[PDB]
Point group: D2
Chain length 329, copies 4
């Protein structure tokens, strides 16, 4: 005597609801909403859970997203201040962090993030024993190590956004200069995400043709090196212009989630544990070309860098290991 009861009948047999390709996003900031809508628009998950501390903003983000249900293919959208809402995720994207202040030292900024992460990550793993974590938060190589350390996850189930987007940007700029689509141009920015990112000049190519053998070469002087500078610059340009970053990054992450979710074994420059790789001796995460599958990092692509290069790589590992003087102030 209910509309529902008059209209929907039942088979004698049935099974408790279910979600198998669940993904959870932490933070409903600009990066978070951008990551969440590109995952959605991509049909990577049969469930998406959004987790933030800001009640209002969360519910409202949740709602906006739910109202568009008819236009999507993700069955269940949810949000929670509580972590049990993320219970059963395949993948977790973390985009929650502090943004670095007036007179803040990289040590104090990472320390700040350590005390936020203490509440985030422990709860994720308890509700999602089988998840893989994807750290977006900056500084990414340090926050990845923290997430690793805070969770207790095999090192392969802990990935950092690392140098993916940067490479995505490098390939873009090449393409504009060369006249071919960014997906036909191939070059790699690896190392420590940021100003200290190494551009593998000698891997640069189109079709399989090494730019280096043709330009007579290039690494040292005759305007090409430029290409690396506004990869890291043009990123500050954006901020200065818009007041933040979201679209490119979100897109970047969906790219990573598709590979992971669809067990592709595609090669990505993401932040990994690079201990005793290129003479690095301690527990430092940096970007390397990794194959990804559904259990996270499946393998590492062993580049053949020059010393010039690996030296630089080493300088990052030291510098980062130094910050790793964490657990308070």
């Amino acid at each position: 005597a209910t509309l529902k009861d008059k209209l929907i009948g039942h088979l004698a047999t049935s099974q408790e609801p279910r979600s198998y390709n669940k993904i959870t996003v932490v933070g409903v900031g600009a990066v978070g909403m951008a990551c969440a809508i590109s995952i959605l628009m991509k049909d990577l998950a049969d469930e998406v859970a959004l987790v933030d501390v800001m009640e209002d903003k969360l519910k409202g983000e949740m709602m906006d997203l739910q109202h568009g249900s008819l236009f999507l293919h993700t069955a269940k959208i949810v949000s929670g201040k509580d972590y049990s809402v993320s219970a059963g995720s395949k993948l977790v994207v973390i985009t929650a962090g502090a943004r670095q202040q007036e007179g803040e030292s990289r040590l104090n900024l990472v320390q700040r993030n350590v005390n936020i992460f203490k509440f985030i990550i422990p709860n994720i793993v308890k509700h999602s024993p089988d998840c893989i974590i994807l750290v977006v938060s900056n500084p990414v190589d340090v926050l990845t190590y923290v997430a690793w350390k805070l969770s207790g996850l095999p090192m392969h189930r802990i990935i950092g956004s690392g140098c993916n987007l940067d490479s995505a940007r490098f390939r873009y700029l090449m393409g504009e200069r060369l006249g071919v689509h960014s997906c036909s141009c191939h070059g790699w920015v690896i190392g420590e995400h940021g100003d200290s990112v190494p551009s593998v000049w000698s891997g640069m190519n189109v079709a399989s043709i090494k730019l280096h053998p043709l330009d007579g070469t290039n690494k040292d002087k005759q305007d090409w090196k430029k290409l690396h500078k506004d990869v890291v610059d043009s990123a500050y340009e954006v901020i200065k212009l818009k007041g933040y970053t979201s679209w490119a990054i979100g897109l970047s992450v969906a790219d990573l989630a598709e590979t992971i979710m669809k067990n592709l074994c595609r090669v990505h420059p993401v932040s990994t544990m690079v201990k005793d790789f290129y003479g690095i001796k301690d527990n430092v995460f940096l970007s390397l070309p990794c194959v990804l599958n559904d259990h996270g990092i499946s393998n590492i692509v062993k580049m053949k860098l020059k010393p010039n290069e690996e030296q630089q790589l080493q300088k990052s590992a030291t510098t980062l290991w130094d910050i790793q003087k964490d657990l308070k102030f």
Copy 2:
């Protein structure tokens, strides 16, 4: 003696560049960026041009979007303060408007938008003689009439977002209550977008089963009518929670662009010229189920409303015709 010249050769024959499924978005606000990223993520256009008055914000939005090129399938992304950047668009989405103030009358608010639109729309049509325009801006039914009137476009090449998203929301709420996906539930909210939106109770169905014949009925009293109230409410809820709307709307519009671009002839409740349709006598735009193709509104689905309903429809047409006392203050 250029890398480019050493690496890329030429056929003796070639043809000046080109873009054929060009779309332009006006406004890089929350609705605008949301519309632009869902179109992108959808592969509806081989070119997307973004147009706003805010220099900085535009360039930065443009850039964010360009950096993600590798992850997309839209060849050319551009932005301009100038309208000649939109030269050659198939479709134009307008999301620029004023937001209504402290003590502002709907007449004064529409008047405000009239003086902004005078600079927008005339320029679009001069650069895009063959475009169809899609008005998102609120109040949508009045802003659609203005855009119509300001451009000089056949009435069929002028569409209003109208009541699409609202219906999308109605179908959502049904689905939550019924337990079926929103795309299996069918109901229609038509009329004047907003508080004055008519819910066609008698078209409501699942599988082809009319809810009305089964619930004993319903329109007047026994909690179902509720469903229409928080379709328009839950929309204010969002704002109150998040401070704006974007995702659901953007998604909504991509839905409209796909139909249009792919010449689908799919049925959408969008704002059209409804003169001498349900006894309406003047030049007023309101929502009706329209078939869309690449030249805009192909046809109208002639509902069989009750007087109760059409009366209401008529009350909108009068109320709107009244505002149409435009051209200044």
Copy 3:
């Protein structure tokens, strides 16, 4: 000192290979290859196993298909004369059967198929305890019952192609006559697949508009009924012209596999157990609108047929129950 060893290294950790959305097709005839290439082209399975008795033809079919790997997204293609090759399938499509001879009685033809199926189906279930079976083989309603009976599967994990394609054909013909795409026209052919298929005239509609209320009606005389006759005829037309059927059917089945595999709960007119549904008292399979999910038949859509209709339905159930005098000659 192997190319392979010089080029591919290893993480210290790994896990035994794997296939989770495995589908197996039985028979590499015209229906079988057509079903197998539409599933492939659809990305429904991370593994496809092909099973036939004809060695040569199987290997060669297998190979053709494998050579195109670069163009697909199905990781593993395999074929076997042995059933252990199908070990671990989500879904099994059976397209193996005898074709009915010179002076063969429907009883003798079904008996023929019973003795083939005795070798097929028992082996499938032993290698695939959790599979759902999809019977394509004609006569489908009887072969479905046989497969049901021969396997020992819950009745919900046993589906017959039944009346899906026929409905697909009906919707086509409507569309040609009406001028709208076949997916906008809705009508249902249910009952016993074939000459005895009931056309629900009263469910026929476009947009939600019942053809029956508008044509003054129609079921009895003024050329429309025709529409049902060449749905079943035009099917013999094809054969007479081409010498067999494949494309339409294959396509039909991929449609069923997508729903099943993606847990859609979409409504299909497929052959089900219709005992004590419309006064049918025995163990007979016929076509009804069923919701499908990953465990097979989730529910039944309870049509409201006329007696005229249900009478006909009943005549099938008797006629089929009569054949069910199986187990030899």
Copy 4:
């Protein structure tokens, strides 16, 4: 007083029907039906026209395909014995040819095909002035030259299936041996399609790593060369097993049509005019890596072959130029 008139109304304004991404297939044999269903399944064309001389078979093929309309996204399917049915195609795929007989010389076999093509191709160009032609028919490099010569088309609007599928097969075999997907392995088979196909050993790579530098090398002796032999062999294997080829080829062609139709500028080893390319002096078509767009062959990728290689290339060009003693017997 027609159902149609009671149910479908009209806008005062409209425009004569239309088809813009029309594709036509010639021959409804095994290659032809395989090419036609992969194009369909791919949504590359808003119209597909099928052309063969065999009335019955054509109509029936047409019908099979039409009955599946609901499952596709191609609006209009048609077939004709007449060429005016192909009027307005973007792309034409030719799969009609003779198959070479008991004691037939390659000269007599090409001569046979010349007299069939005289009726095919002239008619295509008259009905489709702006089409590009894709020759599948074997021998492909000679039949491409014939089609070129018979039509009067700019040389860039004439493409041969050439060495695409072979490369697709090579990449497959690599992948099986290496353990990576065929799309991650890259190698090139170019030259004259068939037994005389050159395998560019020195372009072979994974990730960007040249197999040649790692295996110590390889071209001359230590089982790898094998890889080229059963690329051309395993193709005869199929035939011997199945009695023909279809799936892999069809798939291959859809791959070519997508690039062409979507103006991708993707690189394909297809048969082109290779005159005064690698010291070849006459009018001979052979396989080279070409960039394709919507006007056919946009460019050529200038490989750096060894003499060993180019010598071989030259031997083909001579051998083919020799057959080009065509126009009768």
